Amino acid sequence: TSACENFLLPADQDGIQRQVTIFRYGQENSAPKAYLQAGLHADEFPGMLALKYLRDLLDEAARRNRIKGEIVIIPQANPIGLSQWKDGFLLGRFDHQTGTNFNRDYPDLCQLTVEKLDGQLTENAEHNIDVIRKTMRSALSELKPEQAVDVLRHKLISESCDADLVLDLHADNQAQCHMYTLTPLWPAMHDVAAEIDARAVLLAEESGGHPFDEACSAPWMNLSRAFPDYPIPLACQSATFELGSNDEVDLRLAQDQAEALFRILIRRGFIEDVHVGELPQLACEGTLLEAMQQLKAPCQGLIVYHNRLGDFVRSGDKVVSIVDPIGETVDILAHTDGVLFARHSQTYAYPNKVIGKIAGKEPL
Amino acid sequence: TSACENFLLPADQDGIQRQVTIFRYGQENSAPKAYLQAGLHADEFPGMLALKYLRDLLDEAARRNRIKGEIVIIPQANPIGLSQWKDGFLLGRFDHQTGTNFNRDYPDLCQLTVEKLDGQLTENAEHNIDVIRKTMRSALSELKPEQAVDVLRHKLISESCDADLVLDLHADNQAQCHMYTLTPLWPAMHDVAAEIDARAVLLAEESGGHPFDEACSAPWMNLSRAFPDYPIPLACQSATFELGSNDEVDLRLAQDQAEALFRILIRRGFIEDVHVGELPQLACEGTLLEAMQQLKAPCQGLIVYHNRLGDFVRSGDKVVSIVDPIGETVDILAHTDGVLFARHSQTYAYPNKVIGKIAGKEPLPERKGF
Ligand SMILES: [Mn+2]
Ligand SMILES: [Mn+2]
Ligand SMILES: [Zn+2]
Ligand SMILES: [Zn+2]
């Protein structure tokens, strides 16, 4: 009662062909559609173990015949990064062959569909959703990527663009559970943030060079703006969950995160004959990404933190110092009030290294 | 206060010349000699901060004119590794240019001196120590390394081989404070182990491919065996201190470790007009390296630990599992009673990855030849 696909990438520079294993729990192309992936950055582990245990919960839901939609699970979304060992360490953030970030350069499904949708939209929002989703699938079918990493990105967006719910599971080098989403999907995804116990929710309409979560949700916002004459709702509700620290692999945590993801699926109509009960209290407000402070090391040296992970800090507070063991010490200050939701796992800096993050409000 | 030397390495593949900063607090070639280095593995930080604070303590001792010997301090013994960033991470264990481990392929000063010492030894132990140390310095003078990493290794052993006390400050990926020394320097270095609060003391006569600590202490043991007709004491007392986890950078800890290193220097006659007092409780017995179990991942996957760092584990206990999130789970057991003094910081495995260490007392059948 669970489908398993092993999608084969083309051979890399060493002639090695890698596979993306994809699990599907429901009725193909039916009902509501959910997409959950982990390990796009192959060195970010908590999502991998969480989806292993979410599978155990969905295996039971399938046996009890309780799966209402199509639920797509990819515990290891990036088998290219997962092979990239150097000197005994897994470096899973950048592609060795291209040097590019695994969570950048996704297709713009607005740019690829605006031409095709010219005469296809009506006053019926539900019609527009089905037309836009079919157009997106067609547009992607016409693309012929060659590099393993481009083929990987292509498959992942092909299997997620038409979903109602998309959770990209990530981690930071040393961080509290936090969430990113498209600004206008707040407060729509309050329930998701609450269930996973996010300690920061960071909002943007456009962030970097076309990341995966924005590749899924942004097109609905940009098409709405392209065709203001028609009802185009934000049909694909995507978010990035930073579930914790890159190396935070704990049995209890992964089980708790799997249970939270299961509760999210129940709340959004993927699981039948299960009572959830009261939504947990959200521990933070949604804030703009533009209001977040990156703490940067102005020089090389030891990273000495004066604040614990998750401390509420005030503008002017000494948060972290760079200590040259054969030289000088430099103090680095908070420039905004907020929560120090991220630091770093490797306590040595190079100049301009991001060594921490504070979720602020941008007051005036 | 102190002498400061900036020893220049030859230019690397990008034409960049790196320097090793060396501090000296005493006279020269004087009294007892101490050598302390940190960051030979450039991604191992606790020793770097500890020696910065040990310098603060020695600056004050120098101002008060209380340094009795020569004390040599190198907080960052490896400026080659310290530059080796890849994808925003510091890879400080292996040399990019040679592929070699920074703490391997040191000179065998027994092999380099046995020929020269043929007719130089007498019934006077103290004479033999001075003869062997002078011979070691000469033997090293004759060597002409060309590659930056070989020149670096050469300088570090040249400035440490003739020391009475050598502490090579290291860290492990995720570990409790623990110590390695030459088997016959146990119990001699019980005081050192006690002051640094080692939770494991691991003994070997020869470990891997010629590491630094053994390069300093082994020659005395091997020369004693080469010339059994003469008194050759273990003149150079070396140990490796794994001070904690690679990224364990804490003000309190570095200050506590600096204070402990200072107390070791006082106990061994390097600091005047300071009394130390009662030796702290030793937390563990000295055990053989061959009695230590390396836990190895038999396959790739998530590393899921069932035991906390520092837990006492029994033979047969499930300590760690390798979990393929799209496959099977494999359980890994303790095969000896002992303390799980090390695990690992990066909780994903490749086959044969060492993912933990248990300090046992019974020698294990598989642990021969390291
Ligand atoms: Mn400081
Ligand atoms: Mn398990
Ligand atoms: Zn990420
Ligand atoms: Zn080391």
- Angular region, A45: left φ>0, alpha ψ -120 to 50, beta rest: alpha
Q: Which residues contact B205 (CB under 8 A, 6 or more apart)?
A: B182, B183, B184, B218, B221
Closest Cα partner for B54 from B25, B33, B31, B18?
Answer: B25
d(CA B24, CA B29): 11
Nearest to A350 among B85, B93, B345 (CB): B85
CB A87 within 8 A of CB B246: no
Cβ of A49 within 8 Å of Cβ of B302? The answer is: yes
Q: Are strands B165-172 and B33-38 parallel, antiparallel or unpaired?
A: parallel
Flag whether residue B86 sits within 8 Å of chain A, measured between CB atoms: yes
Alpha helices for chain B (secondary structure H) = 46-63, 125-141, 148-158, 190-196, 212-226, 251-267
d(CA A315, CA A335): 5
Q: Are strands B354-359 and B338-342 parallel, antiparallel or unpaired?
A: antiparallel
CB A345 within 8 A of CB A245: yes
Q: Is the dihedral of CA A187, A190, A192, A196 positive or negative?
A: positive
Query: Which amino acid does the sequence have at B56?
Result: D
Q: Which residues contact A219 (CB under 8 A, 6 or more apart)?
A: A108, A109, A110, A113, A132, A136, A161, A236
Nearest CA in chain B to A353: B88
Q: Technique behind this structure?
A: X-ray
Cβ of B346 within 8 Å of Cβ of A91? The answer is: no
d(CA A353, CA B17): 23
d(CA A295, CA A336): 11
Nearest CA in chain B to A86: B91
Q: Which residues contact B72 (CB under 8 A, 6 or more apart)?
A: B22, B23, B24, B25, B33, B34, B35, B36, B159, B160, B163
Q: How many angstroms from the chain centroid is the CA of residue A259? A: 18
Residue A29 neighbours by CB distance under 10 Å: 10
d(CA A327, CA B12): 23
Gap from CA of A362 to ligand 3 centroid (Å): 24
Nearest to A49 among B76, B323, B346 (CB): B323
Question: If you ran DSSP here, which 8-state letter would residue A356 be given?
Answer: E
Ion ligand 1, residues whose Cβ is below 5 A away: A 321, 329
Q: Any long-range contacts for B54-57 (C-beta under 8 Å, 24+ apart)?
A: B54/B258, B54/B261, B54/B262, B55/B2, B55/B23, B56/B258, B57/B258, B57/B259, B57/B262
Query: Which amino acid does the sequence have at A17?
Result: Q
Instruction: Write down the domain spans for chain B.
Output: 3-286
Q: How many angstroms from the chain centroid is the CA of residue B126? A: 26
Nearest to B325 among A48, A248, A346 (CB): A48
Which two structure tokens, joined as six digits, stand for B86?
A: 């890849």
- Angular region, B13: left φ>0, alpha ψ -120 to 50, beta rest: alpha
CB B280 within 8 A of CB B272: no
Q: Can you give the C-alpha Rg of chain B in angstroms?
A: 21
d(CA B170, CA B242): 5
> For tokens 């559970």, what's the residue?
A177
Identify the architecture of domain A3-286 in CATH. 3-Layer(aba) Sandwich (3.40)
CB A59 within 8 A of CB A2: yes
Phi/psi at B197 (5° precision): 65, 50
d(CA B257, CA B298): 36
Alpha helices for A81-147 (secondary structure H) = 125-141
Gap from CA of B344 to ligand 2 centroid (Å): 17
Chain A residues with CB under 8 Å of B249 CB are 302-304, 347-348
Work out how many CB contacts closer than 8 A connect A with B. Answer: 97
Cα B54–Cα B58–Cα B61 angle in degrees, nearest 5:
145
Question: If you ran DSSP here, which 8-state letter would residue B109 be given?
Answer: T
Cβ of A326 within 8 Å of Cβ of B21? The answer is: yes
CB A169 within 8 A of CB A213: no
Which two structure tokens, joined as six digits, stand for A212?
A: 């995966």
- Angular region, A323: left φ>0, alpha ψ -120 to 50, beta rest: beta
Q: How many angstroms from the chain centroid is the CA of residue B149? A: 18
Closest Cα partner for B102 from B90, B92, B111?
Answer: B92
Q: How many angstroms from the chain centroid is the CA of residue B168? A: 3
- The residues that bridge with A33 in the sheet, in sequence order, are A70
